[PDB]
Design a protein around this ligand. Structure first.
Ligand code: HEM
Ligand code: HEM
Ligand code: HEM
Ligand code: HEM
Ligand SMILES: [Ca+2]
Ligand SMILES: [Ca+2]
Ligand SMILES: [Ca+2]
Ligand SMILES: [Ca+2]
Ligand SMILES: [Ca+2]
Ligand SMILES: [Zn+2]
Ligand SMILES: [Zn+2]
Ligand SMILES: [Zn+2]
Ligand SMILES: [Zn+2]
Lengths: 106, 106, 106, 106
């Protein structure tokens, strides 16, 4: 999928997590977010189209996804332990990573 | 230092971060928590004293600290960007990692 | 792409890197291996098809890819520095990771 | 300990790994290398004391240690599997990380 498609999947699933009632629903949404994040990672965003692949900016862009994926990983552990409210809180808190990257590269 | 001492350091700095007025205070506190987590990471907790250093339990224990350290790292980005409330919120959220490891190994 | 196809992509590029004489070739090859490794993570291998998504086996399987991805990342740093032979050795190095997962989950 | 002494621990143990005759000796030295690398992470090199802990340089310096620690973790897995020759080759290979950082910040 292209970058924007994966971003939509990321955004859609955050909403699903916010309104979910049980752990299974949260786990499923988080799993989809992980796949979308990883798929997004191979993209070169418009704002960095003219930068070299080895540029500090592309390295930072990639690092942003690593941070996100890590937060998704931790959230999954919480969901897997049936801690719905905590997993939901983790999904909400990681919005700060979405924001940080957007400020720099969206 | 002893596992328990690093744990005391982690607990106290969560309080320092909560009471912080500014970004500098939160950064310093996160930095201290990082040191404590990495030092605590080489210890053998009492409940796993009978386990081989190479065991699923000790690998998971080690992984738990990696999760915590990754959260401190993300929180540090927020504080370094002057986002005091966000960094404070990130510190609050990572309490779930503290709790998750305790439930299994404390 | 599916698990098997991403694997063939990993194998083909490892061979490309081995025959490479310039950094551009190595960079391109690792780039493709990174995309393939990440794409493969969304897959559930046949051997773990009937194990819970949160099983220790699935967490270990995921860990294997993280180790692989990290090795690719380290190799890319060397490739981007024009250190061809160093990058090639890093690529050869990680075959041990390929083998480890295969013995356990293939 | 300080940055300098932890670096000594890293250097000495690499020699121990090269001279090692069994898996346990290698695992033991790698374990000491991990502790030293992590403990080392809490330091600001002389050449970066002028840079903010928030600069791209300080972040890159920090990242370097994470790369090294990841390579140590992967080497541990090999040593734990009794693959002495392989673990020795991993140790030899991670020397590129040692050099890559030194070139920039030593
Ligand atoms: C879960 C967190 C995230 C959410 C919910 C999210 C959501 C979105 C949405 C709704 C869009 C606009 C979609 C469109 O233009 O069609 C977008 C765009 C974008 N996102 Fe994110 N995003 C997240 C994390 C990230 C991260 C971590 C990075 C960087 C490492 C990033 C980089 C981008 C870029 C570069 C664009 C612009 C794409 C374009 O206009 O071509 N995003 N994101
Ligand atoms: C910021 C998060 C954390 C906080 C605030 C925290 C706080 C504490 C505190 C106050 C204690 C009691 C110490 C004592 O009574 O002497 C403790 C014990 C312990 N913590 Fe944590 N901890 C955190 C994260 C972790 C993590 C991530 C792990 C595991 C990966 C962990 C493992 C333990 C263990 C095993 C003990 C018991 C030590 C013993 O009884 O000897 N902690 N922690
Ligand atoms: C660069 C390292 C790797 C290379 C070169 C590689 C290569 C391959 C190749 C060529 C195949 C298909 C062989 C056949 O047709 O029978 C394969 C299958 C497989 N690999 Fe890997 N692999 C690597 C790493 C990994 C890792 C790290 C894991 C696990 C974490 C893994 C899990 C699997 C599994 C589960 C299969 C079987 C898929 C199926 O039959 O449906 N591989 N790999
Ligand atoms: C296992 C790999 C490594 C080995 C064997 C190693 C070894 C050493 C040695 C022997 C020294 C000289 C100590 C002295 O002055 O007495 C040194 C210095 C230093 N190392 Fe490493 N090192 C390694 C990895 C790293 C990495 C990954 C970084 C960067 C992230 C790094 C950064 C430094 C710096 C900045 C110094 C200068 C210290 C000073 O000026 O006091 N080293 N290293
Ligand atoms: Ca759009
Ligand atoms: Ca104690
Ligand atoms: Ca106190
Ligand atoms: Ca201070
Ligand atoms: Ca095929
Ligand atoms: Zn995990
Ligand atoms: Zn960072
Ligand atoms: Zn890097
Ligand atoms: Zn491991």
């Amino acid at each position: 999928a292209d970058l924007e498609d994966n971003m939509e999947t990321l955004n859609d699933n955050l909403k699903v997590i916010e309104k979910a009632d049980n752990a299974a629903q949260v786990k499923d949404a988080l799993t989809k977010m992980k796949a979308a994040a990883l798929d997004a990672q191979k993209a070169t965003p418009p704002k960095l189209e003219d930068k070299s692949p080895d540029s500090p900016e592309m390295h930072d862009f990639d690092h942003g996804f690593d941070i996100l994926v890590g937060q998704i990983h931790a959230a999954l552990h919480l969901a897997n332990e049936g801690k719905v409210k905590e997993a939901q809180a983790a999904a909400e808190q990681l919005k700060t990573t979405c924001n940080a990257c957007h400020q720099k590269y969206r």
